[PDB]
Structure formats: C-alpha cells, structure tokens
Amino acid sequence: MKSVITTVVSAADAAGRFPSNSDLESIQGNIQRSAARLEAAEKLAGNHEAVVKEAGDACFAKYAYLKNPGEAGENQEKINKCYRDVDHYMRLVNYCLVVGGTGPLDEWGIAGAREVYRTLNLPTSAYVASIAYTRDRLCVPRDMSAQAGVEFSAYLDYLINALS
Amino acid sequence: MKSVITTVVSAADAAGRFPSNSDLESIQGNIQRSAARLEAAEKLAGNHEAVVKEAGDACFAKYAYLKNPGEAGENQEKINKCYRDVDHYMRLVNYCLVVGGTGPLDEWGIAGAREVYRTLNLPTSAYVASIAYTRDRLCVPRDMSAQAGVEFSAYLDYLINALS
Amino acid sequence: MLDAFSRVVVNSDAKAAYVGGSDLQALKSFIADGNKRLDAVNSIVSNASCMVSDAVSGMICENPGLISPGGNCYTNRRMAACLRDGEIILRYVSYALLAGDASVLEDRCLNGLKETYIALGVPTNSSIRAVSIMKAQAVAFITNTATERKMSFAAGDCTSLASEVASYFDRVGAAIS
Amino acid sequence: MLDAFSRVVVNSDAKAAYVGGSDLQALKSFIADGNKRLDAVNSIVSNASCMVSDAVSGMICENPGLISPGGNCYTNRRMAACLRDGEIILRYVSYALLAGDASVLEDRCLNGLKETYIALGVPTNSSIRAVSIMKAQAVAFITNTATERKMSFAAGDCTSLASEVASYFDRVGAAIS
Amino acid sequence: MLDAFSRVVVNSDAKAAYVGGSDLQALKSFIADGNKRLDAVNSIVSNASCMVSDAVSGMICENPGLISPGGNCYTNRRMAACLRDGEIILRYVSYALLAGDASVLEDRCLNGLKETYIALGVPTNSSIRAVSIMKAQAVAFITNTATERKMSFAAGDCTSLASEVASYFDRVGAAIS
Amino acid sequence: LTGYDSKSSPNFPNRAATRERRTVSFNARVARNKSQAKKI
Amino acid sequence: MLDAFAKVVAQADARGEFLSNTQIDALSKMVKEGNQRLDIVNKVTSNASAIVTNSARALFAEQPQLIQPGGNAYTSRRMAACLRDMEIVLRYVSYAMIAGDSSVLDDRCLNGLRETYQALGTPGSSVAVAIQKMKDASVALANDTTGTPIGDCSSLVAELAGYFDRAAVSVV
Amino acid sequence: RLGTVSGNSSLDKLGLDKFLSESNRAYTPRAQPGFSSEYEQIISATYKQLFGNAYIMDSERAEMAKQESMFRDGQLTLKDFCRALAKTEQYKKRFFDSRPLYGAIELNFKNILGRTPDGLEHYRAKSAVYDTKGYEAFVDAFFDDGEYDEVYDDYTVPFYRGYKTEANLSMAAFTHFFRMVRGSSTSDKANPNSMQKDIPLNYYGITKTPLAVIAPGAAGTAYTESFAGTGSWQSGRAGLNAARVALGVPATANGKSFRVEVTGYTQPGFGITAGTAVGKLYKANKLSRYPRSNKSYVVGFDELTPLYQRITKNGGTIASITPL
C-alpha cells in the first residue's frame, strides 16, 4: 500500500525517528490533490460497466485471432473469464485513486502477473491493447476535468510499462 | 539531508522504481508550505544579531554561576565563544527552513552533541535555557505570520528534545 | 502499512465492490479535517521526550517498589531501557495518528510484546500505569488543557481525535495484559 | 542527496552566511516553476519503458556488429543486461530532474561507471549513442514535439526544463569516456 | 601481539637456542622494575579523559582555522570524531607501555593510518600537534610534574619509563607524517 | 582430546547475545534450539 | 588539448557524420563573438599582478592564521609558493577562455590538485576563498567599458565566471 | 561529487552514498499473507547485498524459489535465507567455482560479513574448514562463529561495515575496503581488480600492506598496477612499479619524498606542441614512448613541481600522491 502516508512513516521507522516536519508537509500535498483524484474515482465507479465493455472488445477487434482453438478464446466461458479479467483492472485502478498512491496495483495486479500469464498461455499484448484503448479516447472537458485525466492516465500507463 | 525530495528519491532507490504519484504528490506539499515557511527564514536572517544577543543574555542571567572560575564561562573569550556557539544554532535553523525538512540540524549540530559537551564540560541544561526563551518569546501577530510561527517554533522543539 | 485510506480499500475488496459515492463521504470529511490531524501530531512531537520522562518517573511516584532493591527498575542499565521502552511505544502511536489506523503497531510494536515482558519478568501492573499517564499527557496536548504550555492554535473542536488517540492507548494495555 | 534547496545551503555554509533576499529569489522562482517540473517528470515516467527499447534497438541498428558473436550484446543475457544498464541510467536522470541538481546521478551512478565499463568491456562509443538517443527522446517528450504521442498540458514554455535535462544526459557521456 | 618476553624467544628461535645467562639478565630486570611499570600505567589511565580534552583543544587554540566553516573540526560530528580519534591513539600507546613492546600499536593502530587520513581529508600536519601535546602530558604524569595534580608515589626514579613512553608517542608522529 | 580445541556447538541453546536487540530478534534468540523437545 | 572548435569535430568524428547546416550556424555564431573573447583575456592578462596581490592581501587580512607563525603560509618560501599557485590558476583560466572550453584547465591544472593539497596539508577551504576572490576581481574588471566599444558581453562574462567556479570546486 | 570539505562530510563522497542510506530491517517474524509489496523489497535488498550488485535474470532467480518461500514463512534472514542463498548454485557459480580458494574467502567476507580479511590468520581460519569439511560447512563458518551474531541482527540485512571504527580490524583494512567496494554502480564482476576470475587482495591482503585510496569517479579512477617481486632470492624483476619506502640519500635531500601514481599515457601528446607527430610513429624497435601506461614515481619535494608539469604536459593524469 505504497501511498504518501505509508512511505514517510516507513522512512522514519527505518531510522528510528519521530514524524518530523519533512513528514508533516508531504502529507499536506495529499490534501491538495484529493479533489483531483477522488472525483476521477467515483466517475469510474458509476460507469465501470459501460467502459469495460468497449475496452474489452478492443483486443477482440485487433487480436481477432484469439478465438482459434488452442488459445485464449475458444468458448463463451473463456470470454466470460476475459471480461472479468479486465473488469478487475479498472477496479484496482479505482483503488489507486482512493488510496492516493500506486499501492493496490503492484501487489495484487502487477505482482505475480508475469508468471501466471506465461503458463496459462495468455498473450499479454491484448492486455496492453485493451488498457491503451480507454487510455486514448477520454476527452478532458466532458468526462473529467483537466486535472483528473492526468491523474487517471498516470495509473493507466503504469500498467502498460509493467506488463510490456 | 532529510528533506521532502531526498525522502522520496531515497525511498524509490531503495525499491528501485520510478517516481510515481506517491512521489509527486509529496512535492506538491512543498509548494503549499514555502509561501510561509520561507517567510520566517527571511525575517530571521535580517534580525539574527538582535536575537542571538537576547538569547544568550537570558542564559547567563539565569545560570550566573557559570562565570565563576573553574567553570566553562570563565573569561570574555569563552563568552565570545558562547555567542559563536549559539549563532550557529540560529543559522542551522535558518538552513532547515529553506530545505523544508530537518536536514542540517540532525547531522551538523545534533549528530555528536552528546560527546562534545560531556567532554568539554559544557552543560547541556543551559542550551535549553536559551532556546526555550526564543520559543516562549515568539509573538505571531506582529513579528511573523500565523503560519510561520507554527513551523518556526517546531524546529526549536526539535533541538530541545534532541538536546535533552 | 494500512492507514485510514487503505482501511476502506480492503473492506470493499473482500466484498468485491467499487468504492463509490455511498462511501466516499467518510473520506471527504477525513480530508477536509486533515489539518486537525496535522495540528495534533505537531502538538505531541514538540515535547515527545518530555512527556516520557514525566511519565516514566511519574509511574514510580505511585509505586516505590520499582527502585526497591531487586526491583525491575533498579540499576541505571534497567532505567536506561525503561526510558527506551517508553520512547518506542510513544513513537509508534505517533505513527498510528499520522496514518489514521492502528495497523502500524499490531505488526511492528505489539506483535509479540506480551511474550517478551513475561520472559524478562517485566510486570503487567506498572506498564499499564506507565501508558495510562502518558495517554493523559497525550490527550491533554491536542486540546489546550496542559498547564504550563498553551500553544496558539486556530479555534474549533478537537474532541474527535481525543476519543481516538486514547483508543490507541488502551489497546496496548489490553495486548500486554 | 542534494536537491536544489540543498545546494544553496552548502554554498552559504562555506561563507557561514544566512540565506536572504538575494538567494531566496532564485528559489522563489523554483517553487513558482514547480507545477511545470511536476508536470514534466510525469511525461517521462509514463513513456519510460518504451524509451529504453527504442534506444537499445537504435544503438544496434547503427552498429550491427554488436549482436555478432563476439559483440558485447551477443547472447540473450548480455542483451537483457543492456536493457537493464540503460534504464538505471534513465532512472537517475528522472531523479535529478525531480530534485533540481545533478548530485544524485553523480554520486550514485557516475561515481564508478568509468571503471565499471572498462572491466566488463562495454564499448564507450556505443553506450553514449544510447544515452544520446534518450537525451533527444526526453527533450522531445518535455516539449510536446513527439511524433506518435502527445500529452495534454496547460499551454506555456518548458525550454528551461528541456535544456536542464540535456545537461544531465551530457555529463553521463563525459563521465564514462 | 608481542611482549618483552616473547621478543626474546623469537630471537633465540632463530639460533635454535635455549635461554641462558646473558639473555635472562635483561629479562629479570624487566621483572625487577615490573612494579614501577604497573605504577606508571595506572597514572595515565586514571586521568586520560582530561588528557584527550586538553590535547585537542591545544591544537585548536594554536590553529584557529580548524573550526572555521570548511575547517576539519567544524561541525559536531567531525569534532566528536576528533575527540575519539585521539582517545583511540591514547588507548594503544598505554597498551605498548604495559606490555613493554611497540608491536601492538604498530599492528593495530599505526599500519595504514597515513593512507587513511589522506583519504578522509584529515590534516596530518595538525594531527601531530595533538600527539606531541599528549607526549608532554604523559611524561609529566609518570614523573610527578603535573602542575595541577600531584599523585602519591614511592620514592625512586622513573626516567627510563619516561624515555620509553616518549618513543611510542614519537613513532605515532613518524607513522602519519 | 578430540581436536586443537573443544568449542561448543552453535546448535546449543542460549548462545547469542540477547542484550539490546529488537523484540522481533529477542524472541528468535531465546528459542534457538528448544523447539524440538517442546514438541517431542 | 582542445578548443571549442576542435570539440565539435571530435564529437562528430565519433559518430562519423557530416556537419549539418545548423551546426555551421553555431560555429559562425561563435566567430562573431570573437573580438569580445579577445577583449576579456586582454583585460585580464594586463592586470594579472594586481589581480593576484590585491586578492592575496584580502585573503590574509581575514584569515590571519595563514601568515601567523605555524600556519601554511608562514615562511618567505611558503608565501612565495602561495602567490605562485594563485597565479598558476589564473593563467590556466585565461588559457581556458580563448579556447572556449575547460580542457586545458583540467588536464594541466586541476586533475591532481585536490590530491596534491591533501598530501601537503594545504587547507582546501582557503584555496577556494583565494580563487573566489580573484573571480569577481576579474569579472568586474571584464565589465570595464573603457577602450572597448559598448555592446553586450553578458554571455561571455558568465562563461568566465564558470571557469573560476569550476576550478574552485575542483580543489575543495 | 568529489572532495572532503564541501558538505562537511567525507564518506558519502567516496562512493558510499547509497550504502549510507539503507537499513532493510524486516520488522516482523513472518511475512503477512495477502500481501507481498513489503517483503519483496526485503528479498531484493538481500539479493543486491549478498550477490554484490550482481545481475540475476528471472530464470536464474526462479531456481531459488524454495528458499524465498521459507523466509517468507516463519524463518529468519541470516540462517534460513543468507545461509541458504550462499549454498545455492547461483552463488557458487560466481564466487566459488570461478576463483581459487582465497578469492572465495575474500568475497564471503565482503558479501556475508561486509569487511576485509586482514592478515594471514583470517584466511587460514577459513581455509582450514574447507580442507576437512567441504564447501557446505565452509559457508557455515562465516555464520556460526562469534562475529556475525554480535554485529548484524537476526532480521537485518548484512550492511557494509569494513570502513568504520567499530569493526575493530586495522587501518590497513580501511584502505582494502576501497579496493573491494568501488562505489555503488559497481559489482564484483565489474571492477578491474577482480573480474570474477581472480583474487582481488592477494599480496596486499596477506601482508597487510596499506594501499593508496583512489576515489571512484576521480580523474585517474582507471589506475591499476601489475605485480612482480624484486630481489634475487624470490627471483624477481626490477622496473615495474615504484618502491614504497624512499630509503637512501634521495629520501631527505630535495625535501621530503612522495609517491605519485599516473595512469593515462598514450603515444600522441608528448612534445612541446599541441598536435601529434607525423611520420614513422614508432622507433626502430617499435615499442612505444611509454611501454606501459600506469607508471608510478618516487619524488622529493623540491622536484615535485617540475615532475607535475612533466606528467600533465605529456598526457598523463595523477591518480594519487601519498607522502612517504
């Protein structure tokens, strides 16, 4: 849970110190950023069912070969286990917009993902294609403000740089 | 040099990662404090000769036995080394106000203080008798703004707990 | 580890639900009352070593058995560590107030404290009194009920954290018991 | 180690002077131009994993003997390390842009990289080409002048922040030479 | 490492010899004056704390640039290290006085001290004034010649030990210059 | 006698310092080699 | 040693590329500032004894323990070796001003100067104060308008201060 | 940045900056289930210290899966992880099987203990365990004696300590630390005194000879010298390095005497000009003007300033000047 609070209280504890003034004003910045980080989270929370749909079938448009036998898309349950696999990644981003930092991604999503995808024969190139779809057609005056979108996209390209 | 910037680039180099928004929202609070924290260090620099003289004259006046022979305040050059010993401490608290954190204090004056006053017979009870005068003599409507005196009085109490 | 922000993200995770406008007001008032949390840790840490020595030497003035011959706080070596056992637990409940959740010390400070004090014969009768008077030093600093110290603070209310930090002080008194 | 505010302290400590109205003005523009510097490091941490592989391929496409048997990047394990060696260099330049001064890559990366590369046998002309690619990649990312990706910023200037990060890349080539 | 007794047995080991008449006479004289050797060592370690405070303050009052900003003893961390760099020096000289042989400060203190001080930046032309002051203090203690401290002793002469301890204190200034 | 010396085994209980160590590491050093016979 | 023109060529030869049209424009901008580059090293080498001695005298005026008996400038020979070193550095900074880069300054003056002053016992904090005093004695002398036609020299004066600050930081 | 007087500190400008920042202290007995984002930092910090900034690829790391699982269970850092990791194949490949026996002892002191073997008896105390009990008890002797338990905790990663006064070794072993650990961006394979194939402190570690300290990043960081004895009993050759003594009438004439070390000596850049000579480029025996770079000198005080100009005006650069 690598947020702004749990990185200063771990730095003082490693030295054996009390929370000094350099700790108390790095959490002032947590206050002046929540207004551009929390309204981008509820907007995802009230519209995640319609945005994970058009982002889900983007990889099923580009990598349309996936529905061959021996691959990730044979039967309908492999699709239902695919629109679930992408529904989680919008939730783990939604947790990273209410904890402040990049905590819930790199312990639950990112951690242990390179080895579950190598042995289950899941191509990671369709993960980075479905994620970069919803990263690339949000427009800043309609769905968010100019300050929420830079916050929202920064946790999106954290995924693509971790997978690829 | 523990500041807000040196906290997060050393927390990140510990893990071996890039600066995320758990490192960028910390430096936002560095902007939300420098408008008032740098105001006190502007006042202290142009006033320090009127403050270091009032600080020592509230120490020897209470600790009048230190001017007896055999003590650490014998003659005029020792007392001239007593204003040199305090005008460092009003300079090191000036250096902590511009780096944001408590960087210069805990590695230039504090680090090794227990062995340089116990060996040279310097009483560590008189140092706190002068710094607490400067803290208790701090009047926020006239001399400062109300938010400088919150944090200017917070570094003197970092000295007092680290000298006691 | 798990602060007040990370507390709601595992309660919502274990039911597999998005965090939304039903429960984003409890973190809206948390942010909007965050300056009261900063004006409470700064009013503790300014005399954090002082409220140890008033309490660890205030524990013994109700109980002279600690500096009895054969007592637990007899020598200077055992008195160095009692003032050292008394500055860790104050430091770790400073960590639980900046975070907003107790979970920083039930894995670091209190994980197995009960078995070390019954190993060394550190008695459970005094350490509860050693933290109860330090808790009263804690709750008397965030509000201006201290005697010779009256820090100039902005007006308002601080009875919210005063029922909170003392709730972080009787959990160690129930863990070491 | 030393940020920009940590450099005016050590410069004024050798004088044993107080920082004042002539030196605070240089740092008062540093906090006014802080929302651009936070806006610009975000543009390089986002496109970080693509800048590396574009630069190790770009070094290889101009020197095809580097994958020949006997070249430094021949096998997989020698190639996998070049993608590692090239991104720790980028990770400290993202640090030195975040602080303000060049004393995090100087004393943790370039203090010892000259004799790192003359013990492994890494060519000191191929490596400074891969640095000079990422120098141009970051300058064309800081200004919105990249070809295939554009990021939405508030309109203004970052010419000063562009030439600062070129100076950080330019001393890597001077160090390991 | 080697005492006065083991110095003899490694010289007669080269000859494949025993110990006889002429080689035990200088060794029985060590046992004869052996009560004075203990009686001189105790006069140093009884008041070594004032001997290291007066010594590094005599170097400072002769060289006022050592406490300038940019002087080697400027901050408290560098000054406290000076206060124990000379306290380690005095500990090993009192070992070679006790064992009667200079092969213990030659091994564990002197060997490599010159290359260590030039690396850290310690001025070696000013480290020898601190030892030469301690040479004058140590010979003014095993002879009752200290101006502000007189110690009771049995009647007799100890000028041979005054030249023994002055040979140790001069080879510390010969190993770092 | 067996060898040049007869130093004790590092598998014997109560062999480390346990003076001013952390509470994580104090409990590790008092129960070093006592866990087997407690469960036997 | 290299100058500012032989620096661009040695860069381009390692990549083996033909100098661009926008890289001859940089060198033709560099020749247009050619008279003023001579006007600074003429104003400095015609004042070199007054630069050193007024700045050496100001050094021992505020640091009297250097010329106190026992210091590291008390002898006539330990003092004559001190004014020589203050003139060594000014000579290799004026060498590094017509060249346009600090290559003759590093390879013939500064590489080894810190390692020398640790061995001899010379206080490096005071060689900085000696060097920094000659910098603004020369910066204010290079802004003298007398004899030169009035224009702007603020990108060349800032470059001359950069060679002094480099030689000052390479001895501490 | 280099120097010793700028920031009123001197050890963080010798390459020990990043090592002076970390603790990696593992504040709980077992790892908490549900999470891995805190103990993964502890795992990887143990890897960069015990292997010494070595690269371990993800297939090389996946050989050591079992161990990393027991330490994340209720087991400890020193005996269940650092002792298990040094008995794997990814450790024995780089530090044991590539070297002679004394290369292995010098790297186990650096990796496990964080210091230097000073004197022949620290080598011999660890050499004799291998001859009677093999490799798997030779690693135990670095752990289960009376040095590890009093310095590092049960759950702290073994940080570097061979430079500080608490490790009561010597002052010659201070200089030997800055031959092993040449900065933070360096590894054991990546420093020019040991290329994972030899013994780094062979003659200097046995005889406790102090070395000149050359700071990483200084102009002259490439200084390296080869070894030959002299004297007819050991059947050695004269003319390779300089002496370390300055013994005769040339000691105190021309002032006191110093030992200078040069590194960069190329064939152009000798004469009193700016450009290389054109023509034949070599004499008839076609060796060089300087048949090897890294020359060292012994020079008095009154000849130090003419020597200095001969060094630098002919291309060389000064790595270290120590007084003799």
Ligand SMILES: *C(=C)C1=C(C)[C@@H](Cc2[nH]c(/C=C3N=C(/C=C4\NC(=O)[C@H](C)[C@H]4CC)C(C)=C\3CCC(=O)O)c(CCC(=O)O)c2C)NC1=O
């Ligand atoms: C002996 C029997 C005995 C003492 C010794 C002394 C210690 C003590 N003090 C309290 C209550 C408080 N202590 C406080 C601490 C401080 N007050 C200050 O102003 C300074 C900053 C600081 C000391 C460094 C505070 C704020 C309180 C509460 C208000 C008050 O004055 O009571 C106790 C607790 C008593 C109990 O309930 O058991 C003790 C033991 N008091 C003694 O009686």
Ligand SMILES: *[C@@H](C)[C@H]1/C(=C/C2=NC(=C\c3[nH]c(C[C@H]4NC(=O)C(C=C)=C4C)c(C)c3CCC(=O)O)/C(CCC(=O)O)=C2C)NC(=O)[C@@H]1C
């Ligand atoms: C209870 C503990 C106190 C009390 C607290 C209140 N403080 C209020 C506001 C406040 N406090 C600070 C300083 C704080 N902010 C920081 O960023 C840092 C350090 C980095 C600190 C210590 C500030 C800046 C403010 C905002 C108002 C101002 O600028 O003056 C406050 C009002 C806000 C609110 O209620 O939400 C309260 C009630 N006040 C009390 O009466 C007791 C004693």
Ligand SMILES: *[C@@H](C)[C@H]1/C(=C/C2=NC(=C\c3[nH]c(C[C@H]4NC(=O)C(C=C)=C4C)c(C)c3CCC(=O)O)/C(CCC(=O)O)=C2C)NC(=O)[C@@H]1C
């Ligand atoms: C030059 C590099 C760019 C450019 C930069 C500008 N950015 C400006 C504003 C800006 N950026 C952010 C986001 C940033 N700040 C943060 O605190 C965090 C995360 C913690 C991030 C990613 C913010 C908040 C702002 C300020 C917006 C506002 O207050 O309106 C900006 C305008 C400010 C100024 O001009 O001083 C500029 C110029 N813009 C460009 O066009 C080039 C390409």
Ligand SMILES: *[C@@H](C)[C@H]1/C(=C/C2=NC(=C\c3[nH]c(C[C@H]4NC(=O)C(C=C)=C4C)c(C)c3CCC(=O)O)/C(CCC(=O)O)=C2C)NC(=O)[C@@H]1C
């Ligand atoms: C501590 C007071 C000891 C003690 C030590 C002795 N010091 C002796 C000689 C001595 N003391 C100084 C330092 C003094 N002179 C100064 O100029 C300054 C500061 C500006 C100071 C603090 C020096 C320099 C010397 C020796 C002169 C030299 O050789 O260079 C000494 C010898 C006899 C004597 O002078 O008393 C002793 C015994 N004396 C004590 O009684 C306590 C234990």
Ligand SMILES: *[C@@H](C)[C@H]1/C(=C/C2=NC(=C\c3[nH]c(C[C@H]4NC(=O)C(C=C)=C4C)c(C)c3CCC(=O)O)/C(CCC(=O)O)=C2C)NC(=O)[C@@H]1C
């Ligand atoms: C020159 C260094 C001194 C001095 C030395 C003399 N000491 C003499 C006798 C002596 N000293 C002690 C105490 C000493 N012996 C111990 O066993 C221990 C500690 C365990 C200590 C400190 C004793 C017991 C004796 C023996 C006779 C006695 O005093 O009862 C001595 C005369 C006897 C001899 O030479 O063997 C001398 C000359 N005396 C001086 O005047 C200078 C200061």
Ligand SMILES: *[C@H](C)[C@H]1/C(=C/C2=NC(=C\c3[nH]c(C[C@H]4NC(=O)C(C=C)=C4C)c(C)c3CCC(=O)O)/C(CCC(=O)O)=C2C)NC(=O)[C@@H]1C
């Ligand atoms: C901005 C780049 C364009 C723009 C594109 C259009 N999007 C349209 C529908 C649509 N957009 C989204 C993404 C958006 N809705 C969300 O709920 C969230 C996150 C919570 C985001 C980023 C979705 C999911 C949908 C489909 C369902 C819906 O409308 O909510 C749209 C109309 C139909 C279409 O063309 O797809 C357009 C034109 N809209 C704009 O106004 C600017 C030009």
Ligand SMILES: *[C@H](C)[C@H]1/C(=C/C2=NC(=C\c3[nH]c(C[C@H]4NC(=O)C(C=C)=C4C)c(C)c3CCC(=O)O)/C(CCC(=O)O)=C2C)NC(=O)[C@@H]1C
């Ligand atoms: C003082 C108000 C108490 C009291 C304190 C004593 N504690 C003693 C030893 C001790 N305490 C701890 C726990 C402490 N160490 C930690 O690492 C942490 C959390 C991170 C805590 C809270 C430990 C592990 C030990 C073992 C020894 C040690 O580590 O120093 C102690 C005895 C010291 C000794 O035996 O030498 C005392 C007196 N005891 C009291 O009676 C009052 C109530």
Ligand SMILES: *[C@H](C)[C@H]1/C(=C/C2=NC(=C\c3[nH]c(C[C@H]4NC(=O)C(C=C)=C4C)c(C)c3CCC(=O)O)/C(CCC(=O)O)=C2C)NC(=O)[C@@H]1C
């Ligand atoms: C790629 C752009 C290069 C290239 C790179 C190679 N680097 C190799 C090994 C290596 N590199 C470093 C330095 C790196 N580690 C750090 O901690 C930092 C900065 C803080 C940096 C820059 C080290 C320490 C090592 C040693 C790894 C080890 O010994 O395990 C390397 C060889 C890998 C191997 O032999 O297994 C290569 C090929 N080489 C090239 O040709 C291009 C120019």
Ligand SMILES: *[C@H](C)[C@H]1/C(=C/C2=NC(=C\c3[nH]c(C[C@H]4NC(=O)C(C=C)=C4C)c(C)c3CCC(=O)O)/C(CCC(=O)O)=C2C)NC(=O)[C@@H]1C
């Ligand atoms: C004081 C009279 C001197 C002076 C002393 C300084 N020594 C500094 C560091 C340091 N010194 C030693 C040598 C010492 N330690 C030993 O273990 C032994 C022999 C057994 C000796 C003689 C070492 C190893 C170190 C390294 C630091 C450490 O070990 O912790 C020092 C600098 C401290 C710093 O760098 O911050 C000083 C100032 N220097 C002086 O100016 C006067 C002459």
Ligand SMILES: *[C@H](C)[C@H]1/C(=C/C2=NC(=C\c3[nH]c(C[C@H]4NC(=O)C(C=C)=C4C)c(C)c3CCC(=O)O)/C(CCC(=O)O)=C2C)NC(=O)[C@@H]1C
């Ligand atoms: C800059 C620090 C001065 C300054 C300099 C200007 N000098 C200008 C022209 C100029 N300078 C010289 C002398 C120079 N040329 C040589 O050949 C030799 C040695 C033999 C020297 C010392 C000459 C001959 C000229 C005439 C060429 C020309 O007209 O450019 C000059 C241009 C004039 C202008 O811009 O109006 C400038 C600016 N002027 C200053 O204000 C500062 C103090």
Ligand SMILES: *[C@H](C)[C@H]1/C(=C/C2=NC(=C\c3[nH]c(C[C@H]4NC(=O)C(C=C)=C4C)c(C)c3CCC(=O)O)/C(CCC(=O)O)=C2C)NC(=O)[C@@H]1C
């Ligand atoms: C998968 C089909 C299973 C299952 C597997 C899990 N095992 C988990 C943790 C874990 N497992 C072991 C035993 C393993 N380590 C060994 O050394 C050996 C044999 C020599 C074995 C079999 C250990 C020690 C642990 C501790 C956790 C750790 O090592 O980090 C585990 C949870 C991982 C976690 O909590 O993060 C799982 C899911 N569990 C299942 O439900 C199915 C049946």
Ligand SMILES: C=CC1=C(C)[C@@H](Cc2[nH]c(/C=C3N=C(/C=C4\NC(=O)[C@H](C)[C@H]4CC)C(C)=C\3CCC(=O)O)c(CCC(=O)O)c2C)NC1=O
């Ligand atoms: C809480 C976090 C969380 C995640 C991130 C995912 C991650 C994840 N996905 C799958 C499992 C899967 N994930 C996918 C999804 C896809 N396959 C592809 O190649 C496409 C990229 C994508 C479709 C869009 C599919 C098809 C499976 C089934 C694989 C199989 O069972 O053979 C599994 C194995 C268990 C299972 O079969 O369900 C796990 C752990 N699940 C989680 O619980």
Ligand SMILES: C=CC1=C(C)[C@@H](Cc2[nH]c(/C=C3N=C(/C=C4\NC(=O)[C@H](C)[C@H]4CC)C(C)=C\3CCC(=O)O)c(CCC(=O)O)c2C)NC1=O
């Ligand atoms: C840059 C960081 C820095 C500091 C924090 C101080 C710390 C400090 N003070 C003194 C030294 C001193 N400090 C004092 C001051 C006092 N003594 C007392 O007994 C009173 C309590 C108090 C008066 C206010 C005196 C009188 C001396 C000289 C004592 C002596 O050696 O005679 C010394 C020894 C060196 C010296 O003699 O100057 C040091 C390191 N100095 C520094 O350079």
Ligand SMILES: C=CC1=C(C)[C@@H](Cc2[nH]c(/C=C3N=C(/C=C4\NC(=O)[C@H](C)[C@H]4CC)C(C)=C\3CCC(=O)O)c(CCC(=O)O)c2C)NC1=O
């Ligand atoms: C400090 C005190 C101290 C001790 C007393 C011993 C105690 C001791 N003994 C053994 C171990 C043993 N001890 C004995 C001894 C005996 N079995 C018999 O049949 C006889 C009754 C008796 C001796 C006559 C035997 C046979 C072993 C077995 C070794 C093995 O299992 O291979 C072990 C485990 C092996 C080891 O750790 O090295 C230990 C800790 N060690 C110590 O450090």
